[PDB]
Amino acid sequence: FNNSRSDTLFLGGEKISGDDIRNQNVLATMAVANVVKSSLGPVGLDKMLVDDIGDFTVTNDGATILSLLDVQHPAGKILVELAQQQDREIGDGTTSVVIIASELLKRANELVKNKIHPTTIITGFRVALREAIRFINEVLSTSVETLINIAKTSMSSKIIGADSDFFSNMVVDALLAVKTQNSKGEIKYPVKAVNVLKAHGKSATESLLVPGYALNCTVASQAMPKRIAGGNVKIACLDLNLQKARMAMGVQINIDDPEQLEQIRKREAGIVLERVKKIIDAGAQVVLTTKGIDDLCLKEFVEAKIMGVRRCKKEDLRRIARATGATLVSSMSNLEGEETFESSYLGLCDEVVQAKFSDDECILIKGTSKHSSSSIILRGANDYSLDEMERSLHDSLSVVKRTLESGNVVPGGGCVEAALNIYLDNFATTVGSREQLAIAEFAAALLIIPKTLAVNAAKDSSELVAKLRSYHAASQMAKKRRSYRNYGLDLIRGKIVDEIHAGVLEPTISKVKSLKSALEACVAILRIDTMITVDPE
C-alpha cells in the first residue's frame, strides 16, 4: 500500500487519480462528519475543544465544532463550509446536513467500485431528490402552540434543553416582540435583534427577558443618575461625539497678532459645547452617543442630572432608536441649521435604569413608545456553560424566525427521513436499470439520521430503526385506512410515537434546504477524479 512515483508528466506538486483520490475524498468527508455524529439527537452530547493555550469551549453546534476543529483538506473544508451554509441560511440543522452529505458520497462511491459511472449515479441521486422534495410537501403543513414547540425540540441536543419549557417560551416570546415590515410588506422577524447578554450568577432558570432592550454600558461619569424616569423619558440616540472640536485636518491656525491666541482657543471648547446645550434643550434626560463623550461636555449633562452614556454599540442604538421612535442623530443640521430638535429627534421611553448583575452592571431601556422589542440575559455557572447556553439559544431561536417567515413545518424525530426512505426506495423501481441502485442508495442513505439519532443512546438501536422503518413502509400502503406517518423516534423512552402530537416540530424550510444543499456538495465531489496539489511558497 501507498501511492507514489511520477515518471512522465513532470508536475510541480502531488496528483492522485482515480480510486486513490476518489477514496481519499470519501475518507475525508467521513472523518469530519463522524466527529459530530455523536452530537446528533436529544441523546447526543456536547464536547470540549481545547486550543493550544489550554482554554476551550464546550458546544453541540455542529457548525462551530467543525469550524473550531482545524480541517485541512478540500473535501473536509467542503463539509465544514456546508455545515456553515446551514447555520448561515436557516440557522439550525448543521450537525445534520453534514452527516447526510458524507453518507451520500460514502454510498455513491460504493456504486462506482461496482463499476457504475459517476454520472449515471449523479442523475440518479438528482431524481431521488426531485421526488423527495415534492414528497416533503406531503408531510408538512401551515401553522395549525406550534411555536413554543418548534423552539423546544430545537434544544434537545443542547444544554438549554434540560430547562426546555422555560427557554422554549422565552425564545418565541422575545423574538415575536421584535417583528417589523422591512420594506414593502415583508413582515420578517429580526434575524438578529434581541441583544442577548449573559452573566455568571444565579440559576440557569433565573435568566431575565428584558421588556425592552439591554444596552451594555455604564453611565459615563459616576456623577450622573443611575435610574431615570418612571413615567416618561426622552432618549437621545446620537452618533456624533460630544468632545472638544479640532477643526479641518488642513486648517492651520496661523497667529500674526498675540491677541487672537486666547480667543479662538477657548472657542474650541464652546463650539462642541453649544452642540451639547442644543441637545439638553430638547428634554434630553437620556443621551446615547455612539462616538463617545468628552469629560468636559459630560459635566454639562451631570450638572443637569442627564443620564448620558459614552461610545455605545452603534448596532444597538440603531435598534434602541427604532424602539423609542427616536432618531440616530448623525449631525444636527436640517436644511442649514443646528439642533437635536427638541423631542423631534428624541425618543419616548418608559424608564431607563442601570441594573446590576454581580461584578457587571448594565443599562436597561425597558418600556418604550414604539419598541415592541425585547432582549434576553442568560445567567449560568460560568462562561463555559454560558457561551453554550446562548450558543444553542440562538441555534434554537433561529428555528423560530424561519418557522414564522415560512409558515410550514414537518415532523422531525427522524420521521421525514424514514418516510422519504421507503417512498424513494419503492419509487426506485420506477426507472429500474443501473439507475435504480442510485435512487435506492439515495433513499437508503437517508436512514443515517434515524439510526444515529438512536445509536447515541448505547442500546441496540436496530430496534426502533426497524420499527419506524416498518411503520412508514406499511403506512404508505393506502397512502385507505387511517394513514399515520409523522411517526418518529422517542429515544428518551425508546419507542415509536407520533411526533406531531408529542410536540416534535421542525420547519419544512430546513429539511428542504438541508437536503437540496448536501447533495450539491456530494455531486461536485463525485466528479472529482484527480487532485493536483501544487507546491506552495
Binding site: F10, L11, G12, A524, M531, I532, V534, P536, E537
Partner: protein, 48 residues
C-alpha cells in the same frame, strides 16, 4: 489546490492545464494551444 491554497474544480481543460503546474517546456506548450482554443472558439479546450 493552487500554490496559494485556493481550491478549484472544473472540466474546462484550458483551466485545468493552466492551474495544473506543468513543468516540462514543450509540455507547457499544450497549455498555450488550449489557451488559444479558448481565445477563438471558446470551447473544446480539452479536445484541442
Amino acid at each position: 489546490k493552487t500554490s496559494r491554497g485556493e481550491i478549484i474544480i472544473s472540466n474546462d481543460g484550458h483551466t485545468i492545464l493552466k492551474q495544473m503546474a506543468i513543468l516540462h517546456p514543450v509540455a507547457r506548450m499544450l497549455v498555450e494551444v488550449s489557451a488559444a482554443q479558448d481565445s477563438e472558439a471558446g470551447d473544446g479546450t480539452t479536445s484541442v
